[PDB]
């Protein structure tokens, strides 16, 4: 495989997979949820859903073109998938959708129907999807009074104040030339995409997205959304992780991989090679957990989210999990590092080299927006092979051993104790 890249003010980056049967072509902007003030919050979600609106999707589906979109903290994307003989049709449709006009998408009826639909979706997310809203409050309290705290989904109190003028103001300030990368993944060649872009004009705008006054800074805090009428207790807990373009990126991900993920109901998940499972399976402390190493442009998060029904033994869950985290600084073995190497090679090659072209388009767009070129997977495997136990211990002493944490929880979290015992459990007192 190979990733090429060229420039004319726009950036054209591709992945010619000749074995695939489709071809995704779309623009990936460099603005995201982290580029909004807290009063126009959710305008990226509303651009996602006016791009995926019914009239626009119908006009797309007349030619056999499926639309896709994604709103992250750092990057938006607007991807159009088609057969590999219709890349010109997809480019001309994306041109007509964004560049040539926006007033037909931003009519009164389409905007009011879409605002109604996104208000319904945000309310449905707020009162029914519990582990994701725990993770969103974890971001909202780890990075508070700072633009990386804003949720990608938007809030009900802000999103019902947006009108068309704010949509157009965000479009003029963020849908720009240098801010964007046009991405073609799947079964298209790079030269075909560049010659077809130069065949059209496709000039988005003059350029220069506004620069944020405040950089992201981690802030140890907690938020407790206690709802006694829920059957479980969802809780995330994280420290300041590593951002992208850091030398400790793959080390932070391998540290997340050491303790892995778990599902107490699957039989092959209870037999993993984690030493936390011997403590966690005896009295059935949780139903599931997953360790995440989230990496953003300015900062990052490293921690775990979990859910449990054993609501009287939440503190034992947090206790054994954090003592296992303290094992990284002091006495992590060689076999755990080798196992995490093999599993992280596995899940990283599943992530970057799955068969779905829209996910490849999102990942390639994000990576060539942030760091200018895509690191191919072989050099990634060499960087994973270069990690030793001393690198993990040095990273854990830098980032894990007695550092501030951020906690978010909802449900029956009365069994979760104060902030100070969870904070003081980050250092063992025995080392």
């Amino acid at each position: 495989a190979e990733v090429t890249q060229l420039s004319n003010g726009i950036v054209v980056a591709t992945e010619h997979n000749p074995s695939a049967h489709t071809a995704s072509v779309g623009v990936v902007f460099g603005s995201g949820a982290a580029n909004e003030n807290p009063y126009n919050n959710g305008v990226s979600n509303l651009w996602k859903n006016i791009f995926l609106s019914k009239e626009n999707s119908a006009v797309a589906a007349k030619e056999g073109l499926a639309l896709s979109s994604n709103i992250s903290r750092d990057f938006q994307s607007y991807i159009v998938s088609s057969l590999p003989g219709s890349t010109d049709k997809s480019l001309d449709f994306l041109n007509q959708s964004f560049i040539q006009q926006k007033a037909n998408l931003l009519s009164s009826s389409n905007f009011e129907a879409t605002k109604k639909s996104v208000l319904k979706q945000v309310q449905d997310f707020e009162e029914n999807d519990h582990p994701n809203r725990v993770l969103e409050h974890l971001h909202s309290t780890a990075f508070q009074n700072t633009p990386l705290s804003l949720p990608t989904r938007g809030t009900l109190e802000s999103l019902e104040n947006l009108v068309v003028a704010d949509l157009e103001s965000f479009a003029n300030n963020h849908f720009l030339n240098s801010n964007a990368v046009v991405v073609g993944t799947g079964n298209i060649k790079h030269e075909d995409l560049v010659n077809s872009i130069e065949s059209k004009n496709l000039s988005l705008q003059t350029g220069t997205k506004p620069v944020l006054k405040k950089k992201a800074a981690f802030l140890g805090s907690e938020v407790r959304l206690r709802d006694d009428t829920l059957p479980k207790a969802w809780i995330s807990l994280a420290v300041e992780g590593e951002p992208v373009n850091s030398p400790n990126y793959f080390v932070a991900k391998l540290a997340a991989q050491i303790f892995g993920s778990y599902n107490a109901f699957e039989p092959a998940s209870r037999l993993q090679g984690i030493k936390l499972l011997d403590n966690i399976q005896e009295y059935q402390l949780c139903d599931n957990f997953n360790h995440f190493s989230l990496s953003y442009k300015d900062s990052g998060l490293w921690g775990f989210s979990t859910a449990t029904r054993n609501v009287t033994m939440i503190d034992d869950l947090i206790h054994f999990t954090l003592k296992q985290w303290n094992r990284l600084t002091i006495s992590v073995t060689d076999t755990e590092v080798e196992r995490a190497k093999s599993l992280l090679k596995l899940q990283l090659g599943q992530l970057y080299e799955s068969g779905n072209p829209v996910n490849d388009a999102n990942l390639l767009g994000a990576e060539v927006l942030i760091k200018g070129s895509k690191l191919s997977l072989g050099e990634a495997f060499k960087k994973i092979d270069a990690i030793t136990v001393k690198d993990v211990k040095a990273w854990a002493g830098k980032r894990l051993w007695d550092q501030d944490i951020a906690i978010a929880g909802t449900g029956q979290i009365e069994g979760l104790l104060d902030y100070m015992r969870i904070r003081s459990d980050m250092s063992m007192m025995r080392w």
Binding site: E127, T229, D418, Y419, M420
Partner: protein, 51 residues
């Protein structure tokens, strides 16, 4: 009546100095470890009454 008087007053000087320093240090550590609880805030939006 009081043959210990000299040593009693100098050990009193040592003990009052050490315990005053311990009392001020312990006031600092109590104000420190309670700082997560003094500054804690609660907001309350009343829930949807349909449930």
């Amino acid at each position: 009546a009081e043959p210990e008087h000299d040593e009693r007053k100098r050990l009193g000087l040592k003990t009052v100095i050490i315990l005053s320093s311990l009392y001020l240090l312990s006031i600092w550590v109590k104000k420190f470890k309670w700082a997560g609880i003094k500054t804690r805030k609660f907001v309350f939006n009343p829930p949807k009454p349909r449930k």
